[PDB]
Each structure stands twice: as C-alpha cells, then as structure tokens.
Symmetry: C3
Subunit: 112 residues, 3 copies
C-alpha cells in the first residue's frame, strides 16, 4: 500500500493540474490590458493636443476681432459704452493649465 499512496498522490497532482489550467483561462486576458491602457492614454492625449491647438487659435483670432471692434466703437464712447459691463469679459489663457494636465496623462501613463 505504498504503491497505493503513490497512486493517490498522482491523482491529486492530475486534478490540481486541471485547475491551474482553468485558472490560467480566466486570469488570461490581462497582460496587454496594461498595454491597452497605455494606448488609450496615448490616442486620448493626442486628440487633446489637437483641441488645445484649435482652442488657442480661436482665442487669439477672437481677441483680434475685439481689437478691431474697439477701434470702430471709439467714435461712440468705446465698447464698454455700447456693450455695458460685459465689455470687461475676456477669455483667459488656459494654455499652460491644459498643457500641464496633458503632460501628466502622458508621464503617468504613456511614458510608463
């Protein structure tokens, strides 16, 4: 019955060999799942840089249309005269702020 305990130890090993395989099946879809995370963060970071491009072009161009509008309304007391207090509203320069967040996403996910 030594040869018996050895046939049982062999059955165990056969069955816990089955599990190892099944397990590997579930925990299987997970390697590049990190590489897929590094790619989502890359394309995203790319579309965000095209918006910063466009967005800063609109800001400059529209601030230039106010420079012209300020000239034309001079002969009227100025823009603040024709527009009211809204003449004070101007678009901020979110370039650096937006830039720094786009750099974080990269450093944190794409360079890693």
């Amino acid at each position: 019955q030594i040869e018996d305990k050895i046939e049982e130890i062999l059955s165990k090993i056969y069955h816990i060999e089955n599990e190892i395989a099944r397990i590997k099946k579930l925990i299987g879809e997970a390697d590049g799942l990190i590489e897929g995370l590094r790619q989502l963060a890359n394309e995203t970071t790319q579309a965000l840089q095209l918006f910063l491009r466009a967005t800063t072009e609109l800001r400059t161009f529209s601030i230039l249309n106010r420079k012209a509008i300020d000239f034309l309304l001079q002969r009227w007391g100025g823009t603040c005269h024709i527009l009211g207090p809204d003449c004070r509203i101007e678009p901020h320069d979110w370039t650096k702020n937006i830039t720094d967040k786009i750099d974080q996403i990269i450093h944190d996910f794409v360079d890693k």
Copy 2:
C-alpha cells in the same frame, strides 16, 4: 522504480509551483490595471473640464463681438444684409451636454 514515480511526482509539483507564482503575478497585475483605469478616467475628466471652461469663455466672448458688430452694421441694413443668411448661424450652448458626459465618466470610473 517506486523511487522513480516519486521523482516525477516531485517534478510536477515543482512546475505547478511555478505556475501558481506566475498566476499570482497576474492576479496581482490586474489590480494595477483596475486602479490605473480609475486614474486615466480621472486626469482625462480633468483636462475635459478645462476645455469646457475655455470653450464656454470663447463662445460668450464671441457672441459679445457680434452684439457690437450688430450695432455698427445697423446703418447698413444690418448684419443679415452684409453677411447674407449666415447671419442666422449662432454657436449652440453645449454646456449641459458636455457636462453630463463628464459626470458619467466620473460616476462610472472615479467614484
């Protein structure tokens, strides 16, 4: 050859011991991806809020430049006269739409 079957039983146990280790590594990886997923969704959601900020300032500011241009062109039949039917085109207010989507990404991933 009893001592043989016992040397093989020992090699299996050696190899299925290696798997357990490797598996624990993945079962340890996906935690990273689970977490890292909630962080990409956070930063992204942050850069999207700065664009909503910038974008609505441009919309308001440019609607105000048309209010001035509307005044100046009065002595000409009005903007619709100088510009044609495009005088009807105005930028929509996507603030709520954009806002709802940024709220989804947060609720779904950051919270």
Copy 3:
C-alpha cells in the same frame, strides 16, 4: 525514508492546494476589466465628439465676425491696416484631423 519523501510530497500538495483556493478568491474581480477599458474609450470618445461640435461652431461663427469686421474697416484701408500683419492669422479647420483621431480610438478600442 521512502515513506518520508511521501509525507513531504503530501505536505506540499496540501499547501499548494491552499494557494489555489486563495487565488480563486481573488481572480474573479478582474475580467470585466477588458469591458472597463472598452467603456472608458467609449465615453471619452463621446465627450470628444461634443467638443468637436462646439469647437467647429465657434470657428465658423468667429470667421463670420471677421467677414463683418472686414466690411466695416474697408473705409480705412482694410483690417490689415488697423490690425497689422496679424490680420492674416485665421483659425484652421481641424475637423478632419480631430475626427480621424476620434475614429482611431473607436476602431482600436470600442469597436475592436
């Protein structure tokens, strides 16, 4: 001492049977994980399409405000006169560019 090696082989099998159990306890929590990557890429791709909509409306509307400003400044030598060389700066049409990137993120992650 054969019955000894058999007692040790039996202890290992007992301990590597404990791991298999504990591992099974963790494993479960990770495979909708691939459906989580597909979802971040989805919403993201949705918020980027609303910005492309907004962004192109600002560009068109602002180019139309320059058309009006070009007319009013005619009785002065033209905008290029009142504004200088910046009169040449105009906002580009990043529609296609931004569109193609949003289609990449989709194909690669949402539709994939």
